[PDB]
Write an enzyme that holds these catalytic residues in place. Structure first.
Site, PDB file in Angstrom:
ATOM      1  N   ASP A  98       0.799  -1.226   0.000  1.00 25.99           N
ATOM      2  CA  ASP A  98       0.000   0.000   0.000  1.00 25.99           C
ATOM      3  C   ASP A  98       0.831   1.276   0.000  1.00 25.99           C
ATOM      4  OD1 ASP A  98      -1.668   2.059   0.488  1.00 25.99           O
ATOM      5  OD2 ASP A  98      -2.899   1.020   1.970  1.00 25.99           O
ATOM      6  N   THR A  99       1.022   1.889  -1.155  1.00 27.18           N
ATOM      7  CA  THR A  99       1.884   3.067  -1.228  1.00 27.18           C
ATOM      8  C   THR A  99       1.223   4.307  -0.602  1.00 27.18           C
ATOM      9  OG1 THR A  99       1.205   3.655  -3.470  1.00 27.18           O
ATOM     10  CG2 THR A  99       2.987   2.117  -3.244  1.00 27.18           C
ATOM     11  N   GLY A 100      -0.090   4.202  -0.391  1.00 27.05           N
ATOM     12  CA  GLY A 100      -0.871   5.251   0.209  1.00 27.05           C
ATOM     13  C   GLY A 100      -0.660   5.348   1.708  1.00 27.05           C
TER      14      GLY A 100
END
Lengths: 99, 99
Positions: free
Chosen positions: B25-27
């Site tokens: 999850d780059t968020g």
């Protein structure tokens, strides 16, 4: 581009005649932007689920451009703390995670 | 690996003698896993912010392995709907977004 994940992957985006700033978020299924004036008919959609739902406006086949590359996808417009480019649009940009 | 974003990037992870399943999850700034029995002293940390805070247990320099590659990072343990591998650990795996 190859994006490093030392910083939040916040990029400049061109959508609907506006230039906004939005996060490349692989954790997000869909693409949600703060209020913007997009073309077309929109359908009402529920997103969220966790803690409650948020009613947004689903617009289809909207074009956004990011770092030179263009994408056509569904974009949902409603009150969002930060603009999300989720996977529907990440796949359109030819975007991969890599290690 | 090169990961495509057609599906949720759910991968198998080796952390603390368990094999769990977790999202790339780059968020997400940080790495949060559901209850697991990790070594060490932990500090109490607040995460969330939006809609309320969630009290988790911050453990340091924990090793997780993903698709063959090992990483040492901070891992926070508490009630999370899905296990998140966020950027602190994405950078450790030598992980980039690419398009």
């Amino acid at each position: 581009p190859q994006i490093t994940l030392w910083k939040r992957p916040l990029v400049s985006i061109k959508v609907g005649g506006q230039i906004k700033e939005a996060l490349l978020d692989t954790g997000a299924d869909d693409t949600v932007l703060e209020e913007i004036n997009l073309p077309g008919k929109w359908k009402p959609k529920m997103i969220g689920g966790i803690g409650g739902f948020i009613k947004v406006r689903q617009y289809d086949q909207i074009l956004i451009e990011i770092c030179g590359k263009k994408a056509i996808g569904t974009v949902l417009v409603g009150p969002t703390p930060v603009n999300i480019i989720g996977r529907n649009m990440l796949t359109q940009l030819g975007c991969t995670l890599n290690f």
